[PDB]
Paper text:
Then glutamyl-[name] reductase ([name]) reduces the tRNAGlu-bound glutamate to glutamate-l-semialdehyde (GSA) in an NADPH-dependent manner. Three mechanisms have been characterized for plant [name] activity regulation, which are (i) the end-product feedback inhibition by heme4, (ii) repression by a membrane protein FLUORESCENT ([name]), and (iii) formation of complex with a soluble [name] (GBP). [name] consists of three domains: an N-terminal catalytic domain, an NADPH-binding domain, and a C-terminal dimerization domain8. [name] directly interacts with [name]’s dimerization domain through its tetratricopepetide-repeat (TPR) domain7910.
In the present study, we obtained the 2:2:2 FLUTPR-[name]-GBP complex and solved its structure. A stable FLUTPR-[name]-GBP ternary complex was obtained with excess amounts of GBP and FLUTPR. The ternary complex crystals belong to space group C2, while the [name]-GBP binary complex crystals belong to P212121, and the FLUTPR-GluTRDD binary complex crystals belong to P6522. The structure of the ternary complex was determined by the molecular replacement method using template coordinates of [name]-GBP and FLUTPR-GluTRDD, and refined to a resolution of 3.2 Å. The ternary complex resembles the shape of a merged structure of the two binary complexes. The positions of [name]’s C-terminal region are quite different when the ternary complex and [name]-GBP are superimposed. GBP and the remainder of [name] have no significant change, except that the linker between NADPH-binding domain and the long “spinal” helix of [name] cannot be traced in the ternary complex. Conversely, the linker between the two C-terminal helices of [name] that is missing in [name]-GBP or FLUTPR-GluTRDD can be observed in the ternary complex. Compared with FLUTPR-GluTRDD, there is an extra ionic bond between the catalytic domain of [name] and the third TPR motif of FLUTPR. The two spinal helices in the ternary complex are almost identical, which is reminiscent of Methanopyrus kandleri GluTR8.
Numbering used by the authors:
A (entry chain B): 94 to 224, 228 to 273, 277 to 351, 353 to 409, 412 to 468, 471 to 527
B (entry chain F): 200 to 316
C (entry chain D): 56 to 139, 142 to 307
D (entry chain C): 56 to 305
E (entry chain A): 94 to 408, 413 to 468, 472 to 527
F (entry chain E): 198 to 316
């Protein structure tokens, strides 16, 4: 028995205040995989952690015991009780699992990462490849194929609402009647798209707070359509004080607290005097109660589901499900391709017992001589080989065709019945 | 000393017949020590194939591959086609016990191409 | 309860089924029922094809069935008026063709103005009337197209969990002989349990509402795991079991 | 024609099917259609179990469908009056037929009977249909192949495509090449085929050489036609008969 | 691909005036089987001929060409044009063919012969075809099992109790056609006191017939019947007084084995009219095939003729016995076919040995050329066949299954397919 | 020495003739081999030649004639009480019956053949 299982907390089943307790950094990926394989019913393991999901891919001997051992590990790593995890856990088994990771790599599910960060991370997961056996690696490697295949055959990616994109949109959903002085803390991959999707909405000026000034200056010249000014983290609390809505994306514990915002001035009377703290950084940078302040409201990555939803984004979605369906049933075809391998080993084991017994019962009736023994042994192995070659060849099958694969497995079943390879 | 080779050689197969791989492993070691000393390529592959087989029963599959890979080397060094096919099967047998069905599959595919001739 | 609203069930029936009975009046004053293929617009108002002309009484009633796993047949009846501008005619003539893949004569296209919808759960049931507003606003169940396919897959590939759900999620007083799964929607799923005593239908709810296909499978796998841990005694069954059953006659 | 009388088809439908739509009038005067299970006596008169009441206007109409191989759906509609059996010996006669048809029991407080006055009969949807007198209906007998028709058709369509295709060349004068052909139905007089082609989709009626009375009669008749058609195409014998020309679009 | 086919003229599809031209007596059975197997697409054959049916059961290579050849043989033997046969031909294939012969042996296909004549005849066919090379094993296998079905229906269901026979219906039809004014009081006459003749008298007695005149060759035969049924008066007359008896009878039942008619128009014209109590009509009921009454004696105003075809008139709520017997037919029909499917692996068992020999021979010859001998040669040969035998024993044993168990049978056939794919035996 | 060498010559010659499809030329070879084997009074060599005769008849379609010679190797083996070639005999006979179209009878002989494969 062996099953490919995906376990974890997604954005659709668990709140951000629950997932962030399990957000495993890239540095601890080898350690997380090591611990998971320390479990009895776990052979291989992998950790996929983005701002919209926390998912654990494992190779389990028994899936009922495999899931349990992992769910406990999730509790012993998050502090969240096992009882609460089960009420928010996401769990798919086999081809539902292999499809899911394909649907993630294709950016088909939930808000997207953007600029192929989702596909880049999976490549990075594979690059971190040490002992994550050959089955999990096989699935992830094929997920990269699907991810890039969807990228090149369907530019669905060029019109998809990304996390950073929805951050800009949701900001305008809460803000009246812009402009209206936007500010972005943290200039990264997420930070870039926040400004990029901010510029495309008619934003004249944007304040960007970041550690590296060189990092910001590189962004300003790429997109010359919006005015970008730099200020360091020292004036982070100061820049937020001179902005109507603050975008926070960094890799930090929260940066803005309750009484750190209480000391801030009110926003302009042109936008209602309210401040919008949009936090797309995971774990969060704002919170966990800043919204208690009168002139300030906090929006998590979870609230990005509220907007938006407008046309071809469902046509491209169906065009990608064609790709997913094709590779998903082609990957499972490759997993079934290897099911005959243990039978081939057992057929040699059966053939050897007969070949030995008949040869041992022959030498007892024959001593002499030197070059003859090597002639009676070659005959013994000659009959067996040409007898095995038939079934042996028809147990090894690959490529596609729902007929050759179907017929090969039936051959295995017959050899099991005929030679009693079950025992 | 030449009689000591065949003596312990067939002696090792007896222990493998009665599932005692530890006492079997020791005998094939000595048999190899004699086979190399007498400088006979044919007798060398015998003890080597015996060693790998005795290791498979102890669960030492990864170690066993090394000795099953020796008989592949002895044949190439002697330009001999003897004992090669059984090696490719034996190696593939080990990978199958490791849970690795793709390498075993490739090594089994090669095993089929030799059963013809 | 744990079942979706009757207004939502009627919409779900109207989206899955394509064959209904058009009840109308005769000149003689006698009621008449004729079979007819139909389609449904975005609001839920039915669109059909007739071989007859528009008569002087326009009031009619459309009865539609939906057989579920050949065990239960929920049904509804749209009661209203039927009648024949090219504005909303070019739209409905397109939706019909998109549903059936066939051509459609625009000279025989009729629309039944929904006044109210009677909604039954099975045969020999009373049913609850539904206002034309509660019906028009209600959305069809998002698991409608995947229900039958998933139900049949569960009934063959997870029978071990279906029997197990009858031991840990419902408080029964009898031994389980056979238990198949009837249906599944956004809120949960129904089971039919057989026994030497008799046969009933139970409604087991999902932990939380399901939105898509992946969600339902994930919810089922979660319930299957807990149900397994309970029977194997790895965790307590810290919840109230389902007690409400329903008599039925096979 | 070579198809049985409409009076006989309606009897055939009433014997095979068990589910219909009861169209009735209310105190409001509105037509109301609800699903209902029914049974049929030796006369063709339907008996159903209804949970509704009353109605004080007893005028009603029972619509029953019969889907044939998922291609054509002949349907009939019994028009008449609903009333209690008589609270006597004729009630126990009905409780037995209901118990024999379904194998389930029956709540006798809910046994209503539709007094047949006249019956409508259509071959499929969107068809005009033919009225049938209650005298012709009662006298007409159900088809002797009704209980094996579906099984025998699927067996032919799955084991006998060669012969089905061959019938389209030697028994019918088609003015085109045939793409696909499935078998629709088979009754005492012959069988219907549906031919698919770029020119159109039509239904043909190929009659048996003589009337068939049983299962052995139908298979021997089919095998006889299958033999002749083979000898004609192989040109071992002449085709001395007039091919079928009449088609029907759908 | 070899299929069991039943072809012929049943009473339900062909009239007696057509079937009697193909009525083969028991004497010509070995010849008929010999001719039929002389055909190209026909291996085995057997001829079942009763007054209700003329049926030829054959084992054909092709079920299309085989039928064509047999149908032509029927035409050349009967004189009837092939086209005219095809408009009345009865034809079933394999599982339907075995189903039919059982329903006939069980007497389910109405009518019956009575007193178990159908079953007695099937035994006789098997007994006669024991020496016939044409009779094969596949046909014998079917017929022998058909007797089993007959004995099972005879013992497990008393369906034979109220079952209408040819003789029974002959009496029923006679009392039905003659005016309702004393159907029994009418003067009865029976020609030929054989098996069919005794059952006429028996059923006449069971309707209150007190007196009957019986015409027959052997008087001992009639006296043997009189001593059996004292409930009815039986008077014996020789054939010399046949017309003399018909002239004094209101209804004449004719059953004999004469190929030519016993009554022609000319003679019946000379006969007086019947009693005025029956309208002066003399009713000739003919339950013989070939008929004993001519086909134009009915042209006489004072005479009406009835054949076996006319026994269809009203041929009974105790039909549960029919369904109880159908349980037996279904039980054996779907079990006999399973037994046939059991034998499909036999050719594969043969090819697999041949495949093994080619390897075993080739490997031993390359061994012997590369090799003093004596007892060593016999030992190396033992190794050569020893490896093969123990290797084949697995697949070989799992190709052989018999003994019901539809699930094991299913797996057995899949074993064959796999051996076909793995070794390319069929290709 | 002289007669024995003559036996083995014509014996393997027939196998050469049977290897390609000329059974009529092969039947002649074993016919001599059988006659030579009988004069030499060698039961072992006699049943070898007898097997060739049967195989050759099978190639000519003369299956019923072949069974007679396959039954001879059984009689020789039973008389000499040596089980060498008995397993092949029951198999060969079943092969003949299979070609005669009598599979039920063939199956019973194969059933005996399968039981001897143990051996």
């Amino acid at each position: 028995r062996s099953s490919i299982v995906v376990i974890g907390l997604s954005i659709h089943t668990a709140p951000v205040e629950m997932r962030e307790k399990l957000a495993i950094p890239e540095a601890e990926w080898p350690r997380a995989i090591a611990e998971l394989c320390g479990l009895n019913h776990i052979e291989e393991a992998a950790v996929l952690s983005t701002c919209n999901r926390m998912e654990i891919y494992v190779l389990a001997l028994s899936q009922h015991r495999g899931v349990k051992e992992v769910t406990e590990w999730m509790s012993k790593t998050s502090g969240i009780p096992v009882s609460e995890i089960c009420q928010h856990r996401f769990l798919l088994y086999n081809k539902d699992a292999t499809q899911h990771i394909f649907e993630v790599s294709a950016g088909l599910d939930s808000l997207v990462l953007g600029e192929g960060q989702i596909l880049a991370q999976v490549k990075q997961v594979v690059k971190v490849g040490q002992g994550f056996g050959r089955n999990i690696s096989g699935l992830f490697k094929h997920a990269i194929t699907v991810g890039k295949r969807v990228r090149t055959e369907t530019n669905i990616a060029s019109g998809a609402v990304s996390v950073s994109s929805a951050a800009v949109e949701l900001a305008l959903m809460k803000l009246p009647q812009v402009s209206a002085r936007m500010c972005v803390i943290g200039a990264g991959k997420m930070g870039k798209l926040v400004i990029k999707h901010l510029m495309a909405k008619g934003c004249t000026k944007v304040v960007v707070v970041n550690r590296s000034e060189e990092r910001v200056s590189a962004i300003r010249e790429e997109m010359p359509g919006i005015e970008i000014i730099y200020r360091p983290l020292d004036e982070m609390l100061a820049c937020a004080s001179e902005a109507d809505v603050v975008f926070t994306s960094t890799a930090s514990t929260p940066l803005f607290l309750k009484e750190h915002v209480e000391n801030l001035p009110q926003a302009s009377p042109e936008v209602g005097g309210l401040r919008h703290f949009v936090d797309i950084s995971v774990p969060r940078n704002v919170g966990s109660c800043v919204g208690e302040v009168e002139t300030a409201r906090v929006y998590n990555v979870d609230d990005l589901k509220e907007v938006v939803a407008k046309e071809d984004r469902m046509r491209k979605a169906m065009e990608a499900q064609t790709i997913i369906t094709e590779e998903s049933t082609q990957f499972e075809a490759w997993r079934d391709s290897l099911e005959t391998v243990p039978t081939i080993k057992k057929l040699r084991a059966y053939a050897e017992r007969i070949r030995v017994a008949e040869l041992e019962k022959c030498m007892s009736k024959m001593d002499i001589n030197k070059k003859t023994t090597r002639a009676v042994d070659d005959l013994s192995r000659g009959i067996v080989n040409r007898f095995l070659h038939g079934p042996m060849q028809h147990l090894r099958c690959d490529g596609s065709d729902s007929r050759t694969l179907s017929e090969t497995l039936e051959n295995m079943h017959a050899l099991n019945r005929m030679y009693g390879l079950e025992k | 000393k030449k009689q000591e080779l065949i003596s312990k050689l067939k002696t090792g197969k007896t222990f493998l017949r009665n599932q005692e791989p530890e006492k079997a492993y020791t005998e094939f070691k000595i048999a190899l020590e004699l086979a190399q000393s007498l400088k006979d390529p044919t007798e060398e592959k015998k003890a080597a194939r015996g060693l790998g087989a005795s290791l498979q029963r102890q669960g030492k599959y990864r170690e066993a591959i090394q000795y099953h890979s020796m008989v592949l080397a002895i044949s190439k060094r002697e330009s001999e086609d003897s004992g090669i096919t059984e090696a490719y099967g034996a190696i593939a047998d080990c990978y199958t016990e490791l849970g690795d069905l793709e390498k075993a599959g490739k090594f089994y595919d090669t095993y089929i191409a030799r059963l013809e001739t | 309860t744990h079942k979706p609203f009757p207004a939502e069930v009627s919409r779900s029936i109207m989206e899955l089924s394509s064959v209904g009975t058009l009840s109308t009046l005769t000149h003689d004053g006698w009621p008449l029922g004729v079979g007819v293929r139909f389609a449904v617009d975005k609001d839920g108002t039915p669109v059909l094809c007739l071989n007859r002309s528009v008569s002087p009484d326009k009031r009619s009633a459309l009865h539609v069935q939906l057989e579920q796993c050949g065990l239960r047949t929920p049904q509804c009846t749209i009661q209203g008026s039927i009648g024949r501008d090219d504005t909303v005619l070019k739209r409905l003539s397109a939706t019909w063709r998109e549903k059936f893949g066939e051509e459609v004569k625009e000279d025989s296209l009729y629309v039944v103005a929904v006044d109210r919808v009677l909604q039954m759960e099975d045969f020999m049931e009373d049913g609850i009337w539904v206002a034309s507003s509660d019906y028009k606003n209600a959305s069809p169940d998002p698991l409608r197209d995947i229900a039958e396919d998933i139900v049949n897959q569960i009934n063959a590939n997870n029978m071990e969990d279906i029997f197990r759900f009858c031991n840990v999620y419902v408080d029964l007083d009898f031994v389980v002989s056979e238990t198949k799964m009837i249906w599944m929607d956004r809120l949960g799923f129904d089971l039919r349990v057989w026994s030497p005593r008799g046969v009933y239908d139970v409604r087991i709810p999902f932990p939380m509402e399901v939105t898509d296909e992946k969600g339902a499978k994930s919810s089922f796998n979660g319930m299957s795991q807990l149900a397994w841990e309970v029977e194997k005694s790895y965790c307590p069954a810290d919840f109230n079991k389902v007690k409400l059953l329903k008599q039925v006659v096979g």
